[PDB]
Amino acid sequence: TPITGKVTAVIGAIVDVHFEQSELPAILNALEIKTPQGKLVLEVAQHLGENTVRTIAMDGTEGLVRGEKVLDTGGPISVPVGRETLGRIINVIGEPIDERGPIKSKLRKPIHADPPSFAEQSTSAEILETGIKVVDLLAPYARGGKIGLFGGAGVGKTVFIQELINNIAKAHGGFSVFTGVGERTREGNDLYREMKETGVINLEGESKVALVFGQMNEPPGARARVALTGLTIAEYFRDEEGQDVLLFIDNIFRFTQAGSEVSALLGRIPSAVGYQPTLATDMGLLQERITTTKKGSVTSVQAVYVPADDLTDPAPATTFAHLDATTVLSRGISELGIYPAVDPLDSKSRLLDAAVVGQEHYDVASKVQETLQTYKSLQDIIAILGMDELSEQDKLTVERARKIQRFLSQPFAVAEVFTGIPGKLVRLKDTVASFKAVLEGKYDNIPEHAFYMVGGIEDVVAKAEKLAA
Amino acid sequence: AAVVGQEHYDVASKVQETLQTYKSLQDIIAILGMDELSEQDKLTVERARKIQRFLSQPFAVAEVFTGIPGKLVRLKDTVASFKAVLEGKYDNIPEHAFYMVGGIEDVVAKAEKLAA
Amino acid sequence: QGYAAEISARRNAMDNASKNAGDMINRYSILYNRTRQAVITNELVDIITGASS
Amino acid sequence: ANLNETGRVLAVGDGIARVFGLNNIQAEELVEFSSGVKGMALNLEPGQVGIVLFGSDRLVKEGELVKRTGNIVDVPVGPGLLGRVVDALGNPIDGKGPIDAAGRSRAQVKAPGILPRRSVHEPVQTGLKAVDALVPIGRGQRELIIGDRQTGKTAVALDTILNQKRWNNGSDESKKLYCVYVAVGQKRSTVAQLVQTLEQHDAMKYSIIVAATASEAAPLQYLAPFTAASIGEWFRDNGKHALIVYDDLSKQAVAYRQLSLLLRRPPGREAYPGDVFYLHSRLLERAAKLSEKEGSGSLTALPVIETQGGDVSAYIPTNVISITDGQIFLEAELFYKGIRPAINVGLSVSRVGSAAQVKALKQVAGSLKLFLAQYREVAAFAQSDLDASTKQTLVRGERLTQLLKQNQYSPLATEEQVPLIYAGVNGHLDGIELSRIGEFESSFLSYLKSNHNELLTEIREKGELSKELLASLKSATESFVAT
Amino acid sequence: NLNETGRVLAVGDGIARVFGLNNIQAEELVEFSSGVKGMALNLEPGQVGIVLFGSDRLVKEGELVKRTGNIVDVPVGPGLLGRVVDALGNPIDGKGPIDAAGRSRAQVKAPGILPRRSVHEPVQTGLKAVDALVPIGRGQRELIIGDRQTGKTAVALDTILNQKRWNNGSDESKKLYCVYVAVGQKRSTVAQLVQTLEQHDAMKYSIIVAATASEAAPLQYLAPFTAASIGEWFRDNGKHALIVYDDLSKQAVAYRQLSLLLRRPPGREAYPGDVFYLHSRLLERAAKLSEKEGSGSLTALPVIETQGGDVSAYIPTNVISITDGQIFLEAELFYKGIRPAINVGLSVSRVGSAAQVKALKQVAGSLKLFLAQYREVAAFAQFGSDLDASTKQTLVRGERLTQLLKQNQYSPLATEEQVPLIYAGVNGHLDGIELSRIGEFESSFLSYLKSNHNELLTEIREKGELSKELLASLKSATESFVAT
Numbered sequence A: 001t002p003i004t005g006k007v008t009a010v011i012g013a014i015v016d017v018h019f020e021q022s023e024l025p026a027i028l029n030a031l032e033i034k035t036p037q038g039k040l041v042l043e044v045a046q047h048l049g050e051n052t053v054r055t056i057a058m059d060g061t062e063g064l065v066r067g068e069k070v071l072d073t074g075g076p077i078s079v080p081v082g083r084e085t086l087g088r089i090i091n092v093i094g095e096p097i098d099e100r101g102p103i104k105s106k107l108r109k110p111i112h113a114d115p116p117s118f119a120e121q122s123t124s125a126e127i128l129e130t131g132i133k134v135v136d137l138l139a140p141y142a143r144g145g146k147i148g149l150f151g152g153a154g155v156g157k158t159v160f161i162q163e164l165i166n167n168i169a170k171a172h173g174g175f176s177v178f179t180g181v182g183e184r185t186r187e188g189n190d191l192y193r194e195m196k197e198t199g200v201i202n203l204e205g206e207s208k209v210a211l212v213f214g215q216m217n218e219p220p221g222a223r224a225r226v227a228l229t230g231l232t233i234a235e236y237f238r239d240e241e242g243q244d245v246l247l248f249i250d251n252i253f254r255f256t257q258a259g260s261e262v263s264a265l266l267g268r269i270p271s272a273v274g275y276q277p278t279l280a281t282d283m284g285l286l287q288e289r290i291t292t293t294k295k296g297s298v299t300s301v302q303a304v305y306v307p308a309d310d311l312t313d314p315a316p317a318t319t320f321a322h323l324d325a326t327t328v329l330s331r332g333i334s335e336l337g338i339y340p341a342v343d344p345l346d347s348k349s350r351l352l353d354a355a356v357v358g359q360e361h362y363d364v365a366s367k368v369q370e371t372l373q374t375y376k377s378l379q380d381i382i383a384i385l386g387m388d389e390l391s392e393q394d395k396l397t398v399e400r401a402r403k404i405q406r407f408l409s410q411p412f413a414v415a416e417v418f419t420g421i422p423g424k425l426v427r428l429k430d431t432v433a434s435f436k437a438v439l440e441g442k443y444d445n446i447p448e449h450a451f452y453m454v455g456g457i458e459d460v461v462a463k464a465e466k467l468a469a
Numbered sequence B: 001a002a003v004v005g006q007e008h009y010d011v012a013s014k015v016q017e018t019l020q021t022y023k024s025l026q027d028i029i030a031i032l033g034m035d036e037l038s039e040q041d042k043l044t045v046e047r048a049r050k051i052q053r054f055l056s057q058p059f060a061v062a063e064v065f066t067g068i069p070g071k072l073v074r075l076k077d078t079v080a081s082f083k084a085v086l087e088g089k090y091d092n093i094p095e096h097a098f099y100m101v102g103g104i105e106d107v108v109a110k111a112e113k114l115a116a
Numbered sequence C: 001q002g003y004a005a006e007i008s009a010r011r012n013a014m015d016n017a018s019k020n021a022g023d024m025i026n027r028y029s030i031l032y033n034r035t036r037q038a039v040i041t042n043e044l045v046d047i048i049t050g051a052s053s
Numbered sequence D: 001a002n003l004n005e006t007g008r009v010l011a012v013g014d015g016i017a018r019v020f021g022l023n024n025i026q027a028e029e030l031v032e033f034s035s036g037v038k039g040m041a042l043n044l045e046p047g048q049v050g051i052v053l054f055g056s057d058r059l060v061k062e063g064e065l066v067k068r069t070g071n072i073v074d075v076p077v078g079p080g081l082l083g084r085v086v087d088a089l090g091n092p093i094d095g096k097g098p099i100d101a102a103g104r105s106r107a108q109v110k111a112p113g114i115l116p117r118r119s120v121h122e123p124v125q126t127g128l129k130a131v132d133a134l135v136p137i138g139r140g141q142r143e144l145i146i147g148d149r150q151t152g153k154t155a156v157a158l159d160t161i162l163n164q165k166r167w168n169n170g171s172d173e174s175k176k177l178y179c180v181y182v183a184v185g186q187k188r189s190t191v192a193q194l195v196q197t198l199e200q201h202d203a204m205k206y207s208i209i210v211a212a213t214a215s216e217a218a219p220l221q222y223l224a225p226f227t228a229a230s231i232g233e234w235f236r237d238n239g240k241h242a243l244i245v246y247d248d249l250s251k252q253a254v255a256y257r258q259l260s261l262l263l264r265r266p267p268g269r270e271a272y273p274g275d276v277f278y279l280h281s282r283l284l285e286r287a288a289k290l291s292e293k294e295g296s297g298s299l300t301a302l303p304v305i306e307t308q309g310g311d312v313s314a315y316i317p318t319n320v321i322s323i324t325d326g327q328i329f330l331e332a333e334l335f336y337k338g339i340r341p342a343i344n345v346g347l348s349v350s351r352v353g354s355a356a357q358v359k360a361l362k363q364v365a366g367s368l369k370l371f372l373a374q375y376r377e378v379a380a381f382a383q384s385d386l387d388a389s390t391k392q393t394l395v396r397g398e399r400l401t402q403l404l405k406q407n408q409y410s411p412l413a414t415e416e417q418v419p420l421i422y423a424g425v426n427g428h429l430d431g432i433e434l435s436r437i438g439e440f441e442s443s444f445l446s447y448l449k450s451n452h453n454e455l456l457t458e459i460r461e462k463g464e465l466s467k468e469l470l471a472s473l474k475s476a477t478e479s480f481v482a483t
Numbered sequence E: 001n002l003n004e005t006g007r008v009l010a011v012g013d014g015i016a017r018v019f020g021l022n023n024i025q026a027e028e029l030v031e032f033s034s035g036v037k038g039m040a041l042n043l044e045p046g047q048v049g050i051v052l053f054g055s056d057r058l059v060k061e062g063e064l065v066k067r068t069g070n071i072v073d074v075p076v077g078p079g080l081l082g083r084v085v086d087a088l089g090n091p092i093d094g095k096g097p098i099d100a101a102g103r104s105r106a107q108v109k110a111p112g113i114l115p116r117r118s119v120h121e122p123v124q125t126g127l128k129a130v131d132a133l134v135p136i137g138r139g140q141r142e143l144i145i146g147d148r149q150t151g152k153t154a155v156a157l158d159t160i161l162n163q164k165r166w167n168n169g170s171d172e173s174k175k176l177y178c179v180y181v182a183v184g185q186k187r188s189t190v191a192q193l194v195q196t197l198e199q200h201d202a203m204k205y206s207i208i209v210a211a212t213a214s215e216a217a218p219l220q221y222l223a224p225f226t227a228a229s230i231g232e233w234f235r236d237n238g239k240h241a242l243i244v245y246d247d248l249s250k251q252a253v254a255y256r257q258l259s260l261l262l263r264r265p266p267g268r269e270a271y272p273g274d275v276f277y278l279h280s281r282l283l284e285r286a287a288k289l290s291e292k293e294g295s296g297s298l299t300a301l302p303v304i305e306t307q308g309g310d311v312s313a314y315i316p317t318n319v320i321s322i323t324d325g326q327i328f329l330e331a332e333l334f335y336k337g338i339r340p341a342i343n344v345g346l347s348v349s350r351v352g353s354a355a356q357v358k359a360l361k362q363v364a365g366s367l368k369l370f371l372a373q374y375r376e377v378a379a380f381a382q383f384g385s386d387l388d389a390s391t392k393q394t395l396v397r398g399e400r401l402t403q404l405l406k407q408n409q410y411s412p413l414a415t416e417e418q419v420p421l422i423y424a425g426v427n428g429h430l431d432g433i434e435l436s437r438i439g440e441f442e443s444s445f446l447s448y449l450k451s452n453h454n455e456l457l458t459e460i461r462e463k464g465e466l467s468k469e470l471l472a473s474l475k476s477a478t479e480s481f482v483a484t
Ligand SMILES: Nc1ncnc2c1ncn2[C@H]1O[C@H](COP(=O)(O)OP(=O)(O)NP(=O)(O)O)[C@H](O)[C@H]1O
Pocket: A151, A152, A153, A154, A155, A156, A157, A158, A159, A160, A339, A340, A341, A412, A415, A418, A419, D321, D322, D323, D349, D350, D351
């Protein structure tokens, strides 16, 4: 029969529940309190001893009264999995919030599950062309890999991701799982408009994507979890229905931030920078699940936020080691009006290897980087002495680097309402050649501005003729 | 001075002023080269560099690292050689002749041995 | 004429160097205070946490 | 005996009081003490209730009898409030009688979700060239104001509250935007004069002011924006439009740091509790534009952050910028040079208004943004040689910034701005002296107001521009360049 | 009977408090009724404090807990070779039960002052820069430190791969078995690695020990100790192992986690007071035994990850002073084309030439000091004031020497390939050759030396010492080739 507890304590997002006899709900289990509204969910965080557990609410605790009856549901939070959830908008607690009735799936799965074992691992080095010059050329993404976009506030992780969705997701065929964590509901409302229009989501048709949203208005319990909901769904499409899944998370930082929000009320001594002492392993449990396995490929792009623009903050620092390709956005670079505001020198990938991209693409890369790195080394002398004090070889490198730098900027179709110029998509073979020519100085005689915000090398000679009039 | 004598104390103080000056000028050396210097300064720097090296010394213990035999220097020989250096009675000898050697004997010995 | 044109240039250039390093000083001054400040807080936390246990 | 509406203080100190009993109490419910001092039920443990005092501790004693209110923290709301000035509990403080309510919203309401929402599209006309042109603000959008102290942060906000008079006067129910000014941590003196200047411009009749000055209790200064939020929320709900102003969030956050440190929660960055984000996020998320199905009401957050030596990178600012829909960074160095409003361009951005603004202006201001934003890095490489390529483009960027210059309390209408940008990007004014730029601004409108009257009228009716009105104005411009 | 059993009082966050277990040892293993194992770390008066090896959803209040009667310990012996085990030494590869010659404990006293010898055997990495500049010795501890994504693991890996040269032989005393400890790494990343080891037939002489990102803090913290024992077997039994701790920075992160949660009060950057002791007692366990004790060695390559190049942060500082030298990798060096991005300036081996090869030693005379002088003159070069024939001279050579030490990943070189390269550089036969072409010089040179003067290359190898005539033949041989 039902197992019922009593509300002993309410503090912020934390609720303490006392259970009459012996059988205490397991840690991570869901509890329910019936409201006049609908119901309130709770997640057993810890056993306090003496038949008391301490939970985190999945919603507001306004109006809770000491002594209240609390129902044990005997399992982790459940979520509808499988093809039934495609083109549906979902909760953290795996419910329909798209005003469109019950998600009538066959199975409901826990959001909590152990990460794929070591024997179950599966690696491969297949390029995934993106049409983005900086990436294609310098830090190539990998099919079924783990990608991450790093940047502080308003450098452009969201828009960048919308460009990736734009290209890959259209000509992908298989299933996508978008997860909005701790972002703007506006953005989420916009993405639901965006899909119904491209036809990715067809209310009356079939659908290629799924939507899960624990946005920045949510309480920290909600936001500490909603990503695990997304993941459970994707993991089904990967392991059960053996599918290629595109899994966009935005923003995954907001999961670790939420972790700290509650951490003190859970009674923990804080850690460096005031983070929950479990920050690493709480990420490892979640990250290690977003993976390709011998049963299905998963490519995932995650948006990484960077508190205070500090890359060494303990949140992002710990992320990196979980990705296969890392592409960082500099504020300074965006203030140059360079977009995407990628850092050509801080961005990395396991795939930039001659064995994968081939000697030429490999070398066009390196040589580009040496150039940029030199420009960087001189940033100080030029700042004080300016250009006139540089030698001759140095002088050239700078003018060339400043060209390469501007050429790395690319108009995005999705970001059109910010450039004005209709967006462009260059190809991998297109990008490498283009840059190789510039690195052989075959364009030195062209005003630096031409390289700014245009497509491939053809667009440079165009804009330069336009301006030379 | 009460403990080591005035001469000892004066050499030791001057050596220090030298290197202190040389340290202070390392701004102007970086930025405006060695070119843009007073002539006294140019010499102070010349002398400071020579002095920096004469302060190193091969330890016996550390032969595994320098392959150079350990040299031990007598306190009076120290003060005498630094005194000489300080008054310019060695301005002609190249910088390397002071590096990783014992007494001023070894500065002369090396100076010739290299010029050979 | 060349020398007196050069001297003028040197003056004007050096003048601007002073303006820029002037503005840079201002920036780094601000950054300095930030770092200082945090140095104090991160250093302090270490103790506070040390102290509760 | 019946500890179910009542309890007794066990201990009180540091702005908290631990009450015994109150067994039927609910979290965040209000409580009254023996001396009429209002508290709030923070945490409920077995045995005792942690209660936060909305006032001096002196007003409480261990032993005192404590009563329930049955009200979760809540405020009076509705139309009546306008033209009145209340505190964090909607208590009347202008002495203008009792608050006339429609009902009572909780200070803790949840945000309209993914579905009841609609892309912001109606502009909020601020009357401020630099803003309207560059970083325009739609209804429902949430735009930050982030500068150093003494930068014209209120000025910007206040002036918008002024500008709405064009619309809040007439019959038009949909063109109307009501104003809510929260005054978090401000001075009693500052608010008085701020009300005075709102009555001196009549804008009082259509605006409500909630203020929790620097003397008042920490949880008041904390509760103030939330309670203002619900007050504004009423309009967004009953199919109307409201503009809430959070002045400032940096002082609200600080009040929170108070309680949070007195409740002995661990300090994070700059001693802030880990949830200081959730504070502002869960507030702003309420400023929003609704769907056609929900009346299409709208509420426009204008929060104010105050930085420290120009610091965008700080832990609070970042948090708020990562919540809002862009920011209007006001830089002091410009303001020290007499540039007002001192908007740094390459650090201010509207994220969702570049599709809500007025056509007319967008047509006439082609790329004007990065023009000036890359004009700043150029003129800061001159103090070298005579280069008539970028030297020529300089004569513009100076006449252009000279053109953005706006004297305070000067709200311009759209039709009046368009011809100025015209002559700006079309360079009809280069032959006019640098110290006769702003002077001409007055001369030119005198010329247009009784001649090319329909040009103003049609841009005021449509808001669009045909190639028809293009040449029709390209005759009214070089005409006045000669005369 | 509360002597051999306890009931659970409270459980949360990997920790379980437990009333009873009266006979329990400090650091003893306990099984919970639910299955999950744990370790006793705080025997307080009323109760015992247990860290779990698993999740805790499965542990409830009042649930009975059981004494094992054993302090944490691992299987050891050559049966482990080729296997991927977790912190406690359980197969996780899928290849079935480990066969062990016995069991060591996780914590073991380091061999005393008494039963040791001088490090005199090389541990040849086959990395030009390393084997000429910072030569590593059988028994010595050598730090690999740098920022993230700098090539720390790559150095360690290229070292392991090299031992093929000796491990496919039959001379047991030239062999070097490798133990790679994965700490806080993601699983797939350990996979990707064991793959590459096999791709190079290098797994038959390695033992991976894995405490991945997701495993319990206690296991992470423990791994290096358990591993140290696995390879201590080799040292004790007359053979030589190589332990790579990848990486200690994480081990400390996790050890911080045990303590903060056990509520032991924290030190600087929330680390425990004895985070230094943590690593010191591990790293000291590496040593080169005396003849009386079997001459077995254990060699340690700890890794450490910095931030922003800062080496003055807590943990790095600690280990930096614990080990017999460091190899600094730098991001700046990397991106301008030095790979390994070793920093000669800051990298040292404190054993030094004692562990080099006599031939390599002979032609590497003074190189490291010279390379310092080179950075010296190159700093003075920034003044862009005219150079003389002395500074330009050493600038030309330092630039070419720098360039001569650059090396591709996965390509370790034999000593006799290294030797003539170094000699060509040092004695200045490279000094009149374009910098971009030094690339082609290397392979074109070696190709020719193999083809023609193979008799030298085979003497160098066999003898390890350039006799006076061999210097002659080499001298001639180099000049010859440089003229093209
Ligand atoms: N490649 C680009 N081209 C043009 N605009 C861009 C580009 N990338 C990003 N942006 C945007 O930079 C701003 C915000 O971008 P956005 O994707 O919001 O940044 P962000 O990191 O997502 N912001 P936030 O999520 O709040 O931290 C403006 O909205 C856009 O101009």
